[PDB]
Ligand SMILES: *[C@@H]1O[C@H](CO)[C@@H](O)[C@H](O)[C@H]1NC(C)=O
């Protein structure tokens with residue numbers, strides 16, 4: 087359906103990142119799934135360019151692609167890991183979880 | 191091929207925006223076309239979430255979609271237009287043209 | 295499409311050596327053209343969060359002193375008054391920034407002025423330069 | 428035990444108790460690398476050396492730095508290199524009742540090491556009348 091945030095759990099052993107990440111074993115990162123057809127609702131915080139590109143695609147679908155449903159705001163998580171051999175802990179490891187999706 | 195900026199001229203009469211936009215009649219807005227397969231090059235400014243989402247999709251597909259090629263930085267253009275009936279001119283009407291693409 | 299606003303777009307699109315002092319430039323028209331000498335009337339409306347940088351009143355003249363008042367009801371309030379030159383003068387601008395700034399603070403959006411001279415698509419218009427914060 | 432139990436305890440402290448957060452965004456634990464030296468102990472005074480492979484990026488605002496050790500007065504030196512030069516980093520006092528781990532403020536010395544090159548630094552601990560390895564903690568923000 088529409089562009090919205092959907093659940094998505096990432097286990098660090100599945101992607102091989104457990105080699106340098108001590109804790110946690112995983113976290114809920116979510117993802118943005120959906121379509122961005124004109125008109126774009128304002129809750130998706132659509133940019134001016136995303137509005138026009140979606141409008142040009144509505145008339146001529148081969149002149150321009152359609153706006154994509156991507157994360158627009160990311161949240162950090164606490165991570166204990168090994169950085170170059172030193173045990174490092176970041177309380178806010180930025181860019182890990184999705185909090186807001188939107189059309190861009 | 192890779193995620194990159196492709197040309198795109200937008201004529202305001204084609205999309206019906208010539209009703210309120212006085213000048214210009216159009217402009218080059220560009221767009222972002224391409225794919226974001228792991229690994230994501232650093233010139234695409236990939237977020238940590240875009241890196242992991244592309245990595246989990248590389249190993250286990252259908253668990254997560256692929257990172258999308260969207261504009262990451264937008265530029266303004268000078269626009270003379272009608273705002274609620276008054277002749278308005280903005281030297282920087284923000285968010286109109288693409289300057290940098292990337293994976294998100 | 296006033297010639298001034300069109301000429302302002304073409305000025306800053308070709309001469310990239312300079313840019314406007316403000317981001318937003320609005321030009322309000324005079325709606326009292328059914329008169330002969332003369333009064334003026336403007337339908338000004340500007341958001342309150344915008345900082346009015348400057349306001350210019352553009353008049354068309356065919357060395358004397360010109361005074362500009364704000365009608366109130368006659369408790370006339372002087373806004374600006376200078377001695378213009380008559381050497382084939384065409385368009386003359388006068389700073390009415392402070393008058394617009396208190397007009398920006400609520401009040402009736404409709405305003406009426408009057409220009410006095412001392413002993414046609416040239417309809418005068420009022421231009422407001424404002425920044426958006 | 429590859430992750431020190433302190434760094435593991437820090438993670439569990441702030442994950443369970445979300446009413447508090449670290450004073451800095453980035454916390455590093457530098458282990459001592461001199462595990463073969465024996466403390467010399469005259470009757471009334473004990474001294475032993477330490478080593479640390481410290482490397483803090485120059486674009487980080489170092490907030491705090493604690494040296495974790497263990498009526499006694501402790502003095503912590505830094506040997507800069509007879510021509511050896513011993514600089515007192517902190518002269519603190521402790522209590523004698525089941526103190527277990529005692530912390531010492533060596534933040535000034537760490538900011539000094541950040542402005543200079545990433546090198547190995549050698550310390551000495553003076554006290555007067557495996558898993559317990561002293562470790563140096565460095566708090567810093569990503570400015
Ligand atoms: C420890 O310091 C040495 C130089 O004395 C350096 O080569 C090495 O990279 C450091 N340790 C680690 C884990 O990087």
Ligand SMILES: *[C@@H]1O[C@H](CO)[C@@H](O)[C@H](O)[C@H]1NC(C)=O
Nearest residue numbers: 274275276337338402403404
């Ligand atoms: C002129 O001002 C009035 C308020 O007195 C307003 O209702 C009207 O919409 C304005 N004119 C235009 C063209 O907007």
